[PDB]
């Protein structure tokens, strides 16, 4: 059994840019220890760098279900960081595709 390597191998894939490929090994941290925060913490930090903040917000608040111990205080600190920036970015767009240059929203001709 292991957890560390699946957390140390993607530990550079995420830092390179391969965020999803990095999570693609992080996801086994949660499947091996679905009651462990760093599982969610690794997969979560990558979702910000992918901009799937929507999912990132879910990962961080999940980690806090397991931080009942001081081996997890490290991550309890993160489940509060990228938890906040994600939900403050998920859909934050003050310049979306909202333009009109043609007919009414419900014209008729017959």
């Amino acid at each position: 059994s292991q957890f560390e390597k699946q957390k140390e191998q993607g530990n550079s894939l995420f830092k390179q840019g391969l965020y999803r490929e990095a999570v693609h090994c992080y996801d086994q941290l949660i499947t091996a220890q679905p009651q462990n925060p760093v599982g969610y913490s690794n997969k979560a930090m990558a979702l910000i760098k992918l901009g799937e903040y929507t999912q990132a917000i879910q990962m961080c608040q999940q980690g806090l279900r397991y931080t009942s111990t001081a081996e997890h205080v490290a991550i309890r600190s993160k489940l509060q960081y990228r938890l906040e920036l994600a939900q403050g970015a998920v859909g934050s767009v003050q310049i979306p595709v909202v333009e009109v240059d043609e007919l009414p929203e419900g014209y008729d001709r017959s």
């Binding site: 957390k7 993607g10 530990n11 995420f14 992080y26 760093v38 913490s41 690794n42 930090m45 490290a74 991550i75 600190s77 993160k78 960081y81 990228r82």
Partner: peptide, 9 residues
């Protein structure tokens, strides 16, 4: 750097 927030574990 200035973070552990942008590190994994």
């Amino acid at each position: 750097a200035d973070t552990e927030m942008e590190e994994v574990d």
